[PDB]
Amino acid sequence: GLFDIVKKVVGALG
Numbered sequence: 001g002l003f004d005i006v007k008k009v010v011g012a013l014g
Helices: 003-012
Strands: none
Touching: none
16 A cells, blocks of 8 residues: 555645
8 A cells, every 4th residue: 555655745835
């Protein structure tokens, strides 16, 4: 998968 990493990057954007 990859989305678990993408949600962590979006989490930094608030």
